[PDB]
Amino acid sequence: NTIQPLLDEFCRLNELPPLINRCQLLVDDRFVLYFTATEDDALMLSVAFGGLEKSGELRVRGLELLARANYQRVGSGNLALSLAPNGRQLVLAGRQPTEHLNSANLTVWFHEIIEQTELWQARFAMLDQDLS
Amino acid sequence: NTIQPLLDEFCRLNELPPLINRCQLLVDDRFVLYFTATEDDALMLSVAFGGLEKSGELRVRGLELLARANYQRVGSGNLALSLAPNGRQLVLAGRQPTEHLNSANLTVWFHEIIEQTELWQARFAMLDQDLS
């Protein structure tokens, strides 16, 4: 119904600190996942996993990867890759109506986005892994 | 397919042809809207509304607009912009499980993707409107 009871049950089941506007939770000592209650009865999950180079070929390479990655399916909730307004931060986010959410599949969705984060962080970091 | 009756009721509700994998519907004599049954028991709407310049600074400006577009909510939240595998076509597309899809909310969605299509077509075309 409302997000707070579902988040409490979610936090209980997976053993996570309490959650509050929006709230955040640190995951695996590595990512900050944000939990936002939209206006139209949906819960958004968003995570910043990296950054785009400021300029040059490396920016363009990351930009071409960004643009194409959203064509295939990224995850549940219409998970999508994007760039924050500062032009630098790489973000994975999606939202789902709270009406169809309960603790179990909120838990599968949490594990899906963490999984996809790690894969995308890896892929973007591998653009600049060559040493001369 | 299991969702053919819903589509046929959605069409017939909206004065539209019946629909065939995937179906294509020509909308307002301007857009070819695709309906796809995904392998996730989901319905995917997709529309190609334009294309990125093949190369040069106008391509990069299109890529920058592409990467930022998906940070905001597009429509409700179940729509994202992407570049097609061919690297040219700009695509608006979103997924939703058939589970709760009814003819009513498939109508609100179908009007939303067409509306967002018109918005983003205009925005990308405004990248190249100055004449010297």
mmCIF file of N, CA and C in Angstrom, chain A residues 1-69:
data_model
loop_
_atom_site.group_PDB
_atom_site.id
_atom_site.type_symbol
_atom_site.label_atom_id
_atom_site.label_comp_id
_atom_site.label_asym_id
_atom_site.label_seq_id
_atom_site.Cartn_x
_atom_site.Cartn_y
_atom_site.Cartn_z
ATOM 1 N N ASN A 1 0.820 -1.208 0.000
ATOM 2 C CA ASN A 1 0.000 0.000 0.000
ATOM 3 C C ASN A 1 0.861 1.267 0.000
ATOM 4 N N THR A 2 1.371 1.643 1.172
ATOM 5 C CA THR A 2 2.362 2.704 1.304
ATOM 6 C C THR A 2 3.758 2.079 1.351
ATOM 7 N N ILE A 3 4.781 2.903 1.100
ATOM 8 C CA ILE A 3 6.129 2.372 0.914
ATOM 9 C C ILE A 3 6.780 2.038 2.252
ATOM 10 N N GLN A 4 6.455 2.790 3.309
ATOM 11 C CA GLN A 4 7.148 2.579 4.580
ATOM 12 C C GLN A 4 6.982 1.171 5.128
ATOM 13 N N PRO A 5 5.766 0.614 5.267
ATOM 14 C CA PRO A 5 5.696 -0.784 5.734
ATOM 15 C C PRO A 5 6.455 -1.759 4.844
ATOM 16 N N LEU A 6 6.381 -1.578 3.519
ATOM 17 C CA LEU A 6 7.094 -2.459 2.596
ATOM 18 C C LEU A 6 8.609 -2.320 2.747
ATOM 19 N N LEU A 7 9.098 -1.097 2.979
ATOM 20 C CA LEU A 7 10.533 -0.915 3.188
ATOM 21 C C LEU A 7 10.986 -1.535 4.503
ATOM 22 N N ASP A 8 10.177 -1.400 5.558
ATOM 23 C CA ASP A 8 10.488 -2.037 6.838
ATOM 24 C C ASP A 8 10.595 -3.548 6.679
ATOM 25 N N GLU A 9 9.592 -4.158 6.041
ATOM 26 C CA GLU A 9 9.657 -5.588 5.764
ATOM 27 C C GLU A 9 10.860 -5.925 4.894
ATOM 28 N N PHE A 10 11.137 -5.090 3.883
ATOM 29 C CA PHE A 10 12.306 -5.299 3.031
ATOM 30 C C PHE A 10 13.594 -5.241 3.851
ATOM 31 N N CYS A 11 13.734 -4.201 4.681
ATOM 32 C CA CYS A 11 14.911 -4.071 5.540
ATOM 33 C C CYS A 11 15.024 -5.229 6.522
ATOM 34 N N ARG A 12 13.891 -5.666 7.091
ATOM 35 C CA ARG A 12 13.903 -6.809 8.003
ATOM 36 C C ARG A 12 14.411 -8.063 7.304
ATOM 37 N N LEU A 13 13.798 -8.409 6.176
ATOM 38 C CA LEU A 13 14.119 -9.677 5.529
ATOM 39 C C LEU A 13 15.601 -9.763 5.170
ATOM 40 N N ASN A 14 16.187 -8.685 4.645
ATOM 41 C CA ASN A 14 17.565 -8.756 4.167
ATOM 42 C C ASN A 14 18.576 -8.171 5.153
ATOM 43 N N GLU A 15 18.132 -7.766 6.349
ATOM 44 C CA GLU A 15 19.001 -7.313 7.441
ATOM 45 C C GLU A 15 19.713 -6.009 7.073
ATOM 46 N N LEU A 16 18.911 -4.967 6.876
ATOM 47 C CA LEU A 16 19.459 -3.681 6.482
ATOM 48 C C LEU A 16 19.033 -2.589 7.449
ATOM 49 N N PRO A 17 19.887 -1.587 7.649
ATOM 50 C CA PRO A 17 19.539 -0.445 8.508
ATOM 51 C C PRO A 17 18.244 0.211 8.069
ATOM 52 N N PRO A 18 17.599 0.916 8.966
ATOM 53 C CA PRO A 18 16.336 1.571 8.666
ATOM 54 C C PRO A 18 16.387 2.546 7.513
ATOM 55 N N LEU A 19 15.230 2.806 6.930
ATOM 56 C CA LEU A 19 15.107 3.710 5.806
ATOM 57 C C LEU A 19 14.016 4.750 6.029
ATOM 58 N N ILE A 20 14.363 6.014 5.842
ATOM 59 C CA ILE A 20 13.438 7.127 6.004
ATOM 60 C C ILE A 20 12.131 6.907 5.257
ATOM 61 N N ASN A 21 10.278 12.967 -0.005
ATOM 62 C CA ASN A 21 11.692 12.779 0.293
ATOM 63 C C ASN A 21 12.165 11.376 -0.080
ATOM 64 N N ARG A 22 13.438 11.109 0.196
ATOM 65 C CA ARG A 22 14.076 9.871 -0.214
ATOM 66 C C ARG A 22 14.960 9.366 0.917
ATOM 67 N N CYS A 23 15.487 8.158 0.738
ATOM 68 C CA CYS A 23 16.456 7.583 1.655
ATOM 69 C C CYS A 23 17.544 6.879 0.871
ATOM 70 N N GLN A 24 18.643 6.609 1.557
ATOM 71 C CA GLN A 24 19.768 5.924 0.952
ATOM 72 C C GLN A 24 20.239 4.805 1.860
ATOM 73 N N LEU A 25 20.927 3.857 1.253
ATOM 74 C CA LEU A 25 21.411 2.687 1.958
ATOM 75 C C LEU A 25 22.715 2.296 1.293
ATOM 76 N N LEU A 26 23.765 2.099 2.084
ATOM 77 C CA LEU A 26 25.012 1.621 1.508
ATOM 78 C C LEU A 26 24.973 0.104 1.361
ATOM 79 N N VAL A 27 25.513 -0.385 0.251
ATOM 80 C CA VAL A 27 25.383 -1.778 -0.151
ATOM 81 C C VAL A 27 26.776 -2.321 -0.419
ATOM 82 N N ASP A 28 27.147 -3.389 0.295
ATOM 83 C CA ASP A 28 28.398 -4.116 0.057
ATOM 84 C C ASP A 28 29.627 -3.215 0.139
ATOM 85 N N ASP A 29 29.539 -2.134 0.921
ATOM 86 C CA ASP A 29 30.651 -1.195 1.115
ATOM 87 C C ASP A 29 31.137 -0.600 -0.211
ATOM 88 N N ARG A 30 30.213 -0.392 -1.157
ATOM 89 C CA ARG A 30 30.636 -0.106 -2.524
ATOM 90 C C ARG A 30 29.692 0.825 -3.281
ATOM 91 N N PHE A 31 28.388 0.726 -3.036
ATOM 92 C CA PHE A 31 27.425 1.561 -3.730
ATOM 93 C C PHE A 31 26.469 2.205 -2.742
ATOM 94 N N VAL A 32 25.981 3.386 -3.116
ATOM 95 C CA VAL A 32 24.875 4.054 -2.448
ATOM 96 C C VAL A 32 23.658 3.916 -3.344
ATOM 97 N N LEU A 33 22.689 3.135 -2.886
ATOM 98 C CA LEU A 33 21.419 2.979 -3.573
ATOM 99 C C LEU A 33 20.418 3.930 -2.934
ATOM 100 N N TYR A 34 19.731 4.731 -3.764
ATOM 101 C CA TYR A 34 18.717 5.678 -3.308
ATOM 102 C C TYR A 34 17.328 5.078 -3.479
ATOM 103 N N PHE A 35 16.438 5.386 -2.533
ATOM 104 C CA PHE A 35 15.053 4.920 -2.516
ATOM 105 C C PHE A 35 14.156 6.149 -2.511
ATOM 106 N N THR A 36 13.440 6.376 -3.606
ATOM 107 C CA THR A 36 12.619 7.569 -3.753
ATOM 108 C C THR A 36 11.179 7.161 -4.003
ATOM 109 N N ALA A 37 10.256 7.809 -3.297
ATOM 110 C CA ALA A 37 8.828 7.603 -3.493
ATOM 111 C C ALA A 37 8.336 8.698 -4.423
ATOM 112 N N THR A 38 8.030 8.323 -5.661
ATOM 113 C CA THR A 38 7.542 9.280 -6.639
ATOM 114 C C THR A 38 6.150 9.758 -6.240
ATOM 115 N N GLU A 39 5.622 10.711 -7.013
ATOM 116 C CA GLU A 39 4.308 11.256 -6.686
ATOM 117 C C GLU A 39 3.196 10.301 -7.093
ATOM 118 N N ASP A 40 3.384 9.554 -8.176
ATOM 119 C CA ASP A 40 2.328 8.697 -8.718
ATOM 120 C C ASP A 40 2.506 7.235 -8.285
ATOM 121 N N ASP A 41 2.605 7.047 -6.962
ATOM 122 C CA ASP A 41 2.493 5.727 -6.323
ATOM 123 C C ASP A 41 3.544 4.748 -6.828
ATOM 124 N N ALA A 42 4.754 5.247 -7.065
ATOM 125 C CA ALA A 42 5.847 4.403 -7.518
ATOM 126 C C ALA A 42 7.052 4.594 -6.616
ATOM 127 N N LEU A 43 7.895 3.564 -6.592
ATOM 128 C CA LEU A 43 9.170 3.608 -5.897
ATOM 129 C C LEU A 43 10.287 3.571 -6.933
ATOM 130 N N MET A 44 11.167 4.564 -6.901
ATOM 131 C CA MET A 44 12.340 4.580 -7.767
ATOM 132 C C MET A 44 13.582 4.106 -7.024
ATOM 133 N N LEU A 45 14.365 3.265 -7.685
ATOM 134 C CA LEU A 45 15.716 2.940 -7.257
ATOM 135 C C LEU A 45 16.717 3.535 -8.241
ATOM 136 N N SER A 46 17.727 4.216 -7.710
ATOM 137 C CA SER A 46 18.760 4.838 -8.517
ATOM 138 C C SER A 46 20.090 4.648 -7.813
ATOM 139 N N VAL A 47 21.149 4.441 -8.595
ATOM 140 C CA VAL A 47 22.496 4.297 -8.067
ATOM 141 C C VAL A 47 23.475 4.924 -9.047
ATOM 142 N N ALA A 48 24.407 5.711 -8.505
ATOM 143 C CA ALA A 48 25.525 6.258 -9.260
ATOM 144 C C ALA A 48 26.690 5.297 -9.129
ATOM 145 N N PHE A 49 27.171 4.808 -10.259
ATOM 146 C CA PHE A 49 28.180 3.779 -10.267
ATOM 147 C C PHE A 49 29.487 4.213 -10.909
ATOM 148 N N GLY A 50 29.544 5.387 -11.526
ATOM 149 C CA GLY A 50 30.791 5.802 -12.136
ATOM 150 C C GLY A 50 30.652 7.185 -12.723
ATOM 151 N N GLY A 51 31.576 7.523 -13.596
ATOM 152 C CA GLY A 51 31.571 8.851 -14.171
ATOM 153 C C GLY A 51 32.122 8.828 -15.564
ATOM 154 N N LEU A 52 31.649 9.761 -16.369
ATOM 155 C CA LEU A 52 32.120 9.918 -17.727
ATOM 156 C C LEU A 52 33.289 10.888 -17.720
ATOM 157 N N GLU A 53 34.310 10.590 -18.512
ATOM 158 C CA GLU A 53 35.401 11.529 -18.727
ATOM 159 C C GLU A 53 34.860 12.907 -19.113
ATOM 160 N N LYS A 54 35.602 13.961 -18.764
ATOM 161 C CA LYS A 54 35.093 15.310 -19.012
ATOM 162 C C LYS A 54 35.038 15.615 -20.505
ATOM 163 N N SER A 55 35.999 15.111 -21.273
ATOM 164 C CA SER A 55 36.095 15.483 -22.676
ATOM 165 C C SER A 55 36.976 14.463 -23.380
ATOM 166 N N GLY A 56 37.002 14.546 -24.708
ATOM 167 C CA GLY A 56 37.882 13.713 -25.506
ATOM 168 C C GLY A 56 37.223 12.428 -25.996
ATOM 169 N N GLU A 57 38.051 11.601 -26.665
ATOM 170 C CA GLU A 57 37.567 10.350 -27.240
ATOM 171 C C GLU A 57 36.974 9.443 -26.185
ATOM 172 N N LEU A 58 37.497 9.509 -24.961
ATOM 173 C CA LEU A 58 37.004 8.623 -23.925
ATOM 174 C C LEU A 58 35.575 8.995 -23.540
ATOM 175 N N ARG A 59 35.275 10.293 -23.457
ATOM 176 C CA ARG A 59 33.887 10.701 -23.265
ATOM 177 C C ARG A 59 32.997 10.161 -24.383
ATOM 178 N N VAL A 60 33.414 10.329 -25.650
ATOM 179 C CA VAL A 60 32.559 9.901 -26.756
ATOM 180 C C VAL A 60 32.334 8.399 -26.699
ATOM 181 N N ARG A 61 33.396 7.632 -26.455
ATOM 182 C CA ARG A 61 33.245 6.183 -26.321
ATOM 183 C C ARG A 61 32.225 5.828 -25.246
ATOM 184 N N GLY A 62 32.303 6.483 -24.086
ATOM 185 C CA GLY A 62 31.323 6.204 -23.048
ATOM 186 C C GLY A 62 29.935 6.655 -23.449
ATOM 187 N N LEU A 63 29.854 7.734 -24.230
ATOM 188 C CA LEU A 63 28.558 8.233 -24.685
ATOM 189 C C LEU A 63 27.908 7.260 -25.660
ATOM 190 N N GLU A 64 28.687 6.706 -26.594
ATOM 191 C CA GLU A 64 28.158 5.725 -27.543
ATOM 192 C C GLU A 64 27.715 4.451 -26.836
ATOM 193 N N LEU A 65 28.451 4.045 -25.795
ATOM 194 C CA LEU A 65 28.051 2.903 -24.978
ATOM 195 C C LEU A 65 26.751 3.185 -24.230
ATOM 196 N N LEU A 66 26.639 4.372 -23.640
ATOM 197 C CA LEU A 66 25.408 4.790 -22.976
ATOM 198 C C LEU A 66 24.218 4.691 -23.927
ATOM 199 N N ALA A 67 24.342 5.304 -25.107
ATOM 200 C CA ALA A 67 23.195 5.432 -25.996
ATOM 201 C C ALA A 67 22.693 4.071 -26.436
ATOM 202 N N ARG A 68 23.598 3.113 -26.638
ATOM 203 C CA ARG A 68 23.202 1.806 -27.151
ATOM 204 C C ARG A 68 22.752 0.862 -26.057
ATOM 205 N N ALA A 69 23.211 1.074 -24.821
ATOM 206 C CA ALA A 69 22.921 0.112 -23.769
ATOM 207 C C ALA A 69 21.442 0.085 -23.437
#
